[PDB]
Amino acid sequence: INFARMYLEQSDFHEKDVCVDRSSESVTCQTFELTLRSCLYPHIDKQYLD
Amino acid sequence: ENQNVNLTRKGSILKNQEDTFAAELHRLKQQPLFSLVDFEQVVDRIRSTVAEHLWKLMVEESDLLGQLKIIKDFYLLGRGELFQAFIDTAQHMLKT
Numbered sequence: 534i535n536f537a538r539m540y541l542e543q544s545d546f547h548e549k550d551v552c553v554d555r556s557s558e559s560v561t562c563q564t565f566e567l568t569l570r571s572c573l574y575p576h577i578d579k580q581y582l583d
Numbered sequence: 584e585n586q587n588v589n590l591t592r593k594g595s596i597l598k599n600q601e602d603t604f605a606a607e608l609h610r611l612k613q614q615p616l617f618s619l620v621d622f623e624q625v626v627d628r629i630r631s632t633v634a635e636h637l638w639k640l641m642v643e644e645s646d647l648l649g650q651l652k653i654i655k656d657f658y659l660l661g662r663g664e665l666f667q668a669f670i671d672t673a674q675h676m677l678k679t
Contacts, residue, residue, distance in 0.1 A: 560605060560608065560609040560612060561602070561605055561609070
């Protein structure tokens with residue numbers, strides 16, 4: 534295990550986003566305030582109610 | 584919208600068709616020329632949907648018929664015998 538960690542696990546350490554771009558569905562994208570109210574405010578209200 | 588502010592979460596008149604009208608508007612945005620005819624057609628479709636849902640709300644949800652019956656009985660003196668007795672009682676009060 535020690536040598537694995539020091540050599541093989543050392544060698545194999547190749548252990549090397551919200552796309553809020555309205556451009557895709559700008560016509561379908563809610564208003565910034567409407568988008569906020571529909572994506573953030575409802576979850577906050579749910580947690581508040583709970 | 585103003586009624587849905589006070590009314591419980593009754594969905595949009597267009598419900599899932601709201602997005603359909605959004606797609607139609609996107610098509611209008613995709614139209615190279617503004618046509619009043621196509622815009623009016625889409626507007627009329629939306630208007631008709633809203634008007635039908637509003638009629639349903641008015642007749643079933645808002646009981647327009649009950650209110651009209653009330654108006655007949657009171658505003659139109661539909662309870663004529665009642666208002667007759669009322670007049671008979673109030674004649675002395677209203678002469679002054």
